């Protein structure tokens, strides 16, 4: 089953998406983030000591 | 013999369109005697399993 979200990007706040599926009982999910490190990449021009 | 009912309270649940048993229809009723008693359509819309 394809279903999409937009869930806020904050630590700890649980966000909840809920599904009206035929022929079942209607579903939910929860999802919350904890560690969204922003890993950047990186170049070198040169060093000092 | 058979099961002499009345007051047939009926309804109907979800409804798909597939090709196979996907349209479900709950239907009440009052038991005057247990037995056995068969359904059957008469139109040409609907088949029944």
Do not use: W
Request: some cysteine; proline content about 5%.
């Amino acid at each position: 089953y394809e279903h999409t979200a937009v869930i806020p990007n904050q630590v700890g706040f649980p966000y909840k998406a809920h599904v009206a599926r035929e022929g079942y009982s209607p579903l939910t999910l929860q999802m919350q983030v904890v560690e969204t490190s922003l890993e950047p990449t990186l170049n070198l021009e040169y060093i000092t000591c | 013999d058979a099961p002499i009912i009345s007051e047939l309270l009926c309804t109907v649940s979800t409804c798909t369109h597939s090709s196979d048993f996907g349209g479900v229809a709950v239907l009440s009723y009052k038991v005057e005697k247990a037995g056995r008693c068969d359904v059957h359509s008469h139109s040409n819309v609907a088949v029944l399993q």
